[PDB]
Amino acid sequence: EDPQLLVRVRGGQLRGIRLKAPGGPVSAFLGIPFAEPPVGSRRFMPPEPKRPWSGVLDATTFQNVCYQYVDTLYPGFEGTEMWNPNRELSEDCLYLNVWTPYPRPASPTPVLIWIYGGGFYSGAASLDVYDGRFLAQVEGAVLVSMNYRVGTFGFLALPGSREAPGNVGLLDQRLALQWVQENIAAFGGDPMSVTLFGESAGAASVGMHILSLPSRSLFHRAVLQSGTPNGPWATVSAGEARRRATLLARLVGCPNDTELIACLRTRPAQDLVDHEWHVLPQESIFRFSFVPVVDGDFLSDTPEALINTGDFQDLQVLVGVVKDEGSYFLVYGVPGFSKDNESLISRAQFLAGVRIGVPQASDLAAEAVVLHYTDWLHPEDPTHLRDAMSAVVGDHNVVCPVAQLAGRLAAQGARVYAYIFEHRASTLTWPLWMGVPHGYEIEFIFGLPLDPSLNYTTEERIFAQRLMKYWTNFARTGDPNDPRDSKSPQWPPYTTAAQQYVSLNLKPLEVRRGLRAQTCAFWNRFLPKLLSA
Amino acid sequence: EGREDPQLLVRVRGGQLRGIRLKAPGGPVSAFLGIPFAEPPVGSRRFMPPEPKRPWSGVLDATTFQNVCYQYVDTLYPGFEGTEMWNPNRELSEDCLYLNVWTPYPRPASPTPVLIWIYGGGFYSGAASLDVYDGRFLAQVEGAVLVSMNYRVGTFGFLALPGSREAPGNVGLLDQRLALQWVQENIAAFGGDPMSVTLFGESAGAASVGMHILSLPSRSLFHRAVLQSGTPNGPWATVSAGEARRRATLLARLVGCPGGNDTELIACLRTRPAQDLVDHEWHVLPQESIFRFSFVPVVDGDFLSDTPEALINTGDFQDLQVLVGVVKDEGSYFLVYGVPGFSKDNESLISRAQFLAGVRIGVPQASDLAAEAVVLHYTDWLHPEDPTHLRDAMSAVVGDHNVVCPVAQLAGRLAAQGARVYAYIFEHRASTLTWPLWMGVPHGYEIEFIFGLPLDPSLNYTTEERIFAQRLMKYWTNFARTGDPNDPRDSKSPQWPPYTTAAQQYVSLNLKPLEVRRGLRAQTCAFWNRFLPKLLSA
């Protein structure tokens, strides 16, 4: 019995497992329950604290993946499979993972909590790209990741009902955060230094913890990679959630909110997932059926209203985007696009893709989009049209929401650092035209290149080490700058006046000004005036 | 006769003329100034189409410029050259339908291609007698026959009650056409070739050239066309029948007025002293505005069979050769005539607030939403409050909306419809310019170079400006002669390629050799020419 692998938490005893990282051992405690299994009649309900247990609970393996849709577009293809569930699917999935160095920290150590993305319809903390061992072994961090309910199970809502009040997947996260507050000290973690970080839907979740008062006492800093609580895809109104839930019920034969939710509770899990995509009001991409809902509770108002009026002093936040946010989504619904060819399109197809990429746009607004993104020097060149379609999607859904959030935070007291990630992995399995797709910074932040068997390049390794530095230095301090590197250039804070941000790639940090400034003014300032009138 | 210069005596359809031997720096030229081409449009002829001049007896003295057509005179900066050089330099009169002719001295052996100049000035002003329109340099240096005519401006030229007999509108343009017919009949007696006639003009003169292209009876009167900083399409050059009616009716009220209605109204207007009409001209504009002119050509279904926009979209322009272009800072001149914050006597650094106010004035026809779109497009979002950027952006809104984008629309529409198009941007600021630096190269300041004024040593231009002026004179005349501004022998010199839809090439005109550029302010003009109409159409 290795006494390093033995921990007592408020619920009982755990045995972890000692894992090998290239630099040495780490302690991993995987599959720790933080909630009672949200099964049977607990479906759609807020999570409850895990009841205490007897003896020593085995925490040496990843627990099950929250029940979710599994992608089928490219069966067996690594670029898609890497995001697919790598454990068995179950509604019994409320478990979290903790990595710490071996031996466990002598002093209270800063905590990074990872919240996975996946459009609020998918994801799991057990994926290889979320492997905590590198950050724990190299930077000596305590790293925590939890599972939270996705799809219908996490976000199906009949707003105002007692038995599907919505946002329970967010409460899943929030409960994990309390668990960390109550227990992390036993692992060597410093509960008074907790940094949330997440990507895509995970970034949006982090954003909603910023905006939801009861979460604020459970963390001190936040990182939002490629995602925001504001924006077109991350929330729905109460009216729209009620519409989609009522529609899905009709679709599965169901049938008072109580009775509708009761029949839904009788339904096998896959019966709900089978119809998940069928409740979107328009044919669209970068749109998800069951996401957080403006309930007047977890979200007191819309994210837009909350960022416009919130007070963010004593908050430090790190935000950014990858070079080609939109490319990934095009192969999933836009005619003309495939990963198996260069996806050179016509003007007509670009017009049609915009109605799909901006599904809520009036004829006029879509006209405005096409006219903005067209290169009038080369209005018909397929290579431009292709790259612009990608840009429309990326800017509409990520880049401009990020710039909007960065802006409101800095202006309202927050300390903000912005990046754009521009390195494309040598190992990337997607075609060249997709550039640096949504999601491909993660393997670097988590330190995967340090694994020699992964066949990354020497420079990609040096680069990954630099990113792990920025992230952990940010966790430690709220400032991603190494306090030992006495070298210009430094990473400056994003402000409303200078609007500085840095590029992350193989070359040294470069300071740029204005994050898609003109093009985001179009999305952030002009379009909303339009679609109204 | 007997004891006068036998080279200055010429007969035209209406009678005998005595011209004058002028000195240009490189030699003498023949000028025939103040040749009448129409009966005086005075009395019961005010507002009427011109009647051709009745033959005179004896030798008409044609040694002096004739009266300037009755017009508003600028009072913004009194005694200031930058303003006064455009003001009338002869007596104002409704009796003003005269034309001028410069030819080599002695007159040419073989028939010589003719250039006809149509002055600009918003259709409310102008005169062929101004210094910057002096044909002596082009005549002496290039051997050209140059003709400039006076045409009626303002109320006298463009007041219309559409459909009536007594004020059908567009009579100012009919004055021009009649001068063009005069050239066809008479120019051969000066050594001019009526089979090679090239129109050129700047601003409203440019737009006039455009309208002759679009009007059928004009088409047989010329062969090639040059449009400098102006277009018949665009927001200022025409008005609907309804709008011209409204403006004419309003102006009548302001002066005391009041066959049936229309006949009596116009009859009353003809009892008014010319100055009374001029004094109320600016008061009929629907909004507070710059780059808008009260009395302009009207879309009448006659001279203009439809809107210029419709005509250029749906026209056949096979075998038409056009040179078009713009100056670097089309809008700056206009800001000092209306937009608060702007003056020639300071740097005109404006606030964001002043910019927003200025946009409403420079784009007076815009809804609040359209106005918003303009402000959002022209704002620098890295420096949205920088007074220098807002200053220059104001100038660019006005210049793009009124000139640069209409020209781009015209050029692309013509090139796609068969025309041979050549396009330029004029970027040289005269060393002698009296306007401030901030105004850059303003509207109208290529003209003195096209006409070769830097060849006058007394004018104090630089040596490089002389060489530059000579290049431009060659471009324009080579184009007049061939339909191609390039010198057929000088392949060593960089070439001026035609403007196409595919490549959108144009050239820079400055002290340096020709530089070819692609894209006539393409993104920004897609905004004005494609998006903006869709908005206001909702």
Ligand SMILES: CCN(CC)CCNS(=O)(=O)Cc1ccc(F)cc1
């Ligand atoms: C790349 C990283 N990403 C987030 C973790 C995983 C993919 N999920 S996605 O939302 O990004 C794109 C997608 C959307 C709808 C759909 F049906 C299939 C895929």
Ligand SMILES: CCN(CC)CCNS(=O)(=O)Cc1ccc(F)cc1
């Ligand atoms: C500079 C060249 N230009 C055309 C020849 C001179 C005419 N002035 S203008 O029509 O261009 C601008 C203007 C408008 C209203 C006003 F009251 C006074 C001036």
Ligand SMILES: *[C@@H]1O[C@H](CO)[C@@H](O)[C@H](O)[C@H]1NC(C)=O
């Ligand atoms: C320039 O002069 C004009 C007129 O006097 C005035 O409206 C404007 O405020 C002045 N601007 C500056 C920069 O002083």
Ligand SMILES: *[C@H]1O[C@H](CO)[C@@H](O)[C@H](O)[C@H]1NC(C)=O
């Ligand atoms: C690949 O691209 C072509 C057009 O370039 C498109 O027709 C096709 O749908 C794409 N993929 C496949 C193989 O279906």
Ligand SMILES: *[C@H]1O[C@H](CO)[C@@H](O)[C@H](O)[C@H]1NC(C)=O
């Ligand atoms: C330029 O030449 C001299 C320079 O002082 C001067 O006497 C003359 O008047 C100037 N010419 C003009 C047109 O200003």
